[PDB]
Each structure stands twice: as C-alpha cells, then as structure tokens.
C-alpha cells in the first residue's frame, strides 16, 4: 500500500555549509563545498516522510561529460568514500550529511536521488554543487596546517605584487577577487576549454583530483598562447588597441573581459599580470598560492645554465610567478610544499608555453631532473652571467660578469601583514 516518496525540494543549506567549508562568499546562490569534509542536505517531502523500514534511497554524483566510477567522476552510495547518513527527521523534512573523498576531482557535480519501496525506482535530480580543494583537510593534497597561512593564501582577496628593480623596489595593490560573483564559474570554464579537455574530456575531469595537474593546466591557460588562454603579452610600450599592463588593478576585469568576448585573448598583460590572474584562479579553486617577484631574472634559451652576452640573452629588472602549496606523490618523497608555477610565456615545455609545477626545494638543491621545468627556473634565480668578448686580435674570450647578479631579493607578501617577506633563501643558498 505504502506509496512512493514525493520530493518537494532539496535545501542545499548554503549558509551553514558556506561557513563550515570556508566558502561563504561563494555560497550566496549555489552550493560550493570543499572536498573531504561533510556537508548538510535537507529533503522536504510532500506526502509522507522517509521510513527506514519501507524506503531505500540511493544517491548518484557525476561530474564532467563522461562520468565513470573507474575515473572517480561518478559515485553511487546508499542512504545509511562517498557517504550519506540520516542526522535528523522532523515532520516533513529529513536532514542528511554527505561526505566526499579527499582525493575527489574538483568541479561541478550533479546530485541525483533514487528512491524505491521494493519495486520501480523513481529518480530525482536534487541540484548541483561545486567541489573545491580543501586546505583545511589533513588528508587533502593541498593541506596547509597553519590557519593564519590558509587565511592569507586561500581566503585573502587583496594583496601586494612587487615590481621595480633590485635597487629600487616598489609595489602595487592588487585585487585578486577570487570570491567575487562569477569568477568561480569563469575558472571552471578555463578548465573546460583547456587543450586536454578538448582532447579527452573524461580523462581531464578525472585528473582534476590533483593540484599538480590543475596547477600545470593553469600555468598554460593563463597565457593565450597555443590555446584559448586568457592574456596576450606585450612589452613594447604601445597598447593603444588594448589595455596597458600597468592599467590593471585586479584579476577580475581581465577574467570577465575574457568570458564576455567568448574566451578571447585580453590585450594586454606582462609578467605580474599573468602571475596575478593565476593566483586568482588557483585561490578560487582552493590551492594556496602566492605571487613572488624575482629581481635580475634571467632568461636561459639554450639550457646551459649561463646567461650569455656578445660584445644574446636577457636579464629582466623583475619577473613574477606564483607558488602553490601541495604534496608531490608523482616525485621522490620530500618535495611537498611550495611549487613554482609560471604562466608568463618564455620557454616551451612539452611543445607549449607553460612552466611548473616544480618544487622550490628542488631548485635550491639543484635537483634539476625533477619535473616540471627545473632547469629553466634554476637559471632564472641562480645563473652565471658570461660575456663572449671579441678581442683586438680577433679572438673571443669568455669572461664572468659579476656587475649584475641574477636572482636577488626574491619577494612575496608577508602573512597577514602589509609588508614584504624576502624568500631568497628558499630558492638558492648564500655563497
């Protein structure tokens, strides 16, 4: 006799979940949660309420265009690792607590409910939730065990980016604005239009379980090179047909301009702009990231770890990239922590203008076989400057130039303060 369950609505509990998962600014309209951590649902029913003796409910989550259990982009779990459990029941409502694994692929999931009383099961789409990286969760790869550092590197929307020269250091304020309306949606689009998604979407969604993979993707997709990336670089001081790199005050205008014109290159940017937009996207996705500036930054073109002049390679007044916090199970043990990611195009990696992630520790120790792109990053911070001087006798003499030392006063914003931290020690040993 007992007739089927009839759902009125699923309450996603935005305000509670938002506060618990540190996504309150993301959760005013849709549910955004962090992986590896329980979140609440409340099912409202129309006829009778859930009855454990009678009913058996099963859940389904799916992400991406080709979801499968093998890939970790589809899970099925019964109402009783993806779990769902009954926490409370009152009149017409049933209160649940779902959990996700700490190694779940980030992104937009669709949540369905199967309800049976022993016969033909009825199906319901409950809604959608976006699942992010979780720096608060000890099992997650991005885990950062310092609360003050999680505040700075994930949650803070304003920061400072260092520019100028080694001698004359200056800075600008920058609005990263990772939690402003529409920015998270633009980040998901960035991943969805990336080359590997276009090539094999099911595998690409599967691998968003790694901050390494995601990190690498972003260091590629922030520049427009090779793809539908965000920024076009320009360095010749003529920007009349775009925006001056120096006009920008924040990542938000760039990301939105990119979306509005159908994922079209944004004119124009330079290093700090690339790094800044990358910091926005990575912070939005929950990967603790920071912008670092390197003074006397060298561009090695022939991988000999020397910067060569002929009286020819380049040393910049400053160059900016980002570091992101994550374990590295793809490497030898001991490389967890900060990974250099570089979205500014300079040298190609695997046929494409991207760079990193590479452990900062690998740079410092000179373990240049470590992926990704350690030889290049080492040269940026710790190269010898060489002049091939032509002599009066027609001979060419190699000489070490110590007038301009590569990799000085490497800088990022202090935790929780409006001040500069020197992190030169993390990249290179003193001599």
């Amino acid at each position: 006799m007992a007739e089927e369950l009839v759902l009125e609505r699923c309450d996603l509990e935005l305000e509670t979940n938002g506060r618990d998962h540190h996504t309150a600014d993301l959760c005013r309209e849709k549910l955004v949660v962090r992986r590896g951590q329980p979140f609440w649902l409340t099912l409202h029913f129309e006829g009778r309420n859930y009855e454990a003796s009678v009913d058996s409910l099963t859940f389904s989550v799916v992400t991406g265009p080709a979801p499968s259990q093998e890939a970790g982009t589809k899970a099925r779990f019964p109402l009783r690792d993806w779990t769902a459990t009954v926490v409370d029941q009152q009149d017409c409502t049933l209160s649940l607590q779902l959990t996700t694994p700490a190694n779940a692929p980030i992104g937009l999931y669709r949540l369905s409910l199967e309800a049976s009383t022993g016969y033909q099961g009825s199906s319901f789409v409950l809604g959608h939730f976006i699942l992010l990286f979780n720096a608060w969760c000890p099992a997650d790869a991005v885990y950062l065990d310092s609360e003050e550092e999680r505040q700075e590197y994930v949650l803070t929307q304003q920061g400072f980016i260092y520019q100028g020269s080694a001698k004359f250091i200056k800075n600008i304020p920058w609005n990263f604005g990772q939690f402003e309306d529409g920015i998270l949606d633009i980040c998901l689009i960035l991943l969805d239009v990336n080359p590997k998604f276009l090539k094999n979407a099911g595998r690409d969604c599967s691998r968003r379980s790694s901050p390494v993979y995601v990190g690498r993707v972003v260091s590629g997709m922030v520049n427009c090179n090779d793809d539908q990336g965000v920024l076009l670089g320009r360095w010749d001081n003529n920007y009349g047909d775009g925006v001056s790199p120096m006009s920008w005050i924040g990542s938000v205008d760039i990301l939105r301009r990119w979306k509005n014109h159908g994922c079209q290159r944004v004119k124009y940017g330079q290093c700090w702009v690339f790094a800044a937009v990358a910091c926005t996207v990575l912070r939005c996705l929950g990967i603790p990231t920071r912008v670092v500036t390197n003074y006397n930054s060298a561009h090695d073109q022939n991988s000999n770890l020397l910067i060569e002049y002929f009286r020819s390679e380049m040393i910049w007044n400053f160059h900016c990239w980002v570091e992101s916090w994550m374990t590295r199970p793809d490497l030898q043990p001991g490389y967890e922590g900060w990974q250099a990611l570089d979205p500014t195009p300079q040298e190609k990696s695997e046929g494409t203008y991207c760079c990193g992630p590479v452990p900062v520790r690998a740079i410092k120790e000179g373990d240049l076989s470590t992926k990704y792109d350690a030889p290049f990053v080492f040269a940026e911070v710790n190269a010898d400057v060489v002049d091939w001087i032509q002599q009066d006798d027609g001979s060419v003499h190699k000489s070490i130039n110590r007038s301009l030392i590569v990799g000085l006063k490497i800088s990022t914003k202090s935790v929780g303060r409006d001040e500069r931290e020197d992190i030169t020690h993390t990249y290179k040993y003193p001599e």
Binding site: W235, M246, W272, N296, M314, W316, N317, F318, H319
Partner: peptide, 5 residues
Amino acid sequence: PALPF
C-alpha cells in the same frame, strides 16, 4: 613595466 637590462 618589466624591462630587459
């Protein structure tokens, strides 16, 4: 701006 030395 960023400038090559």
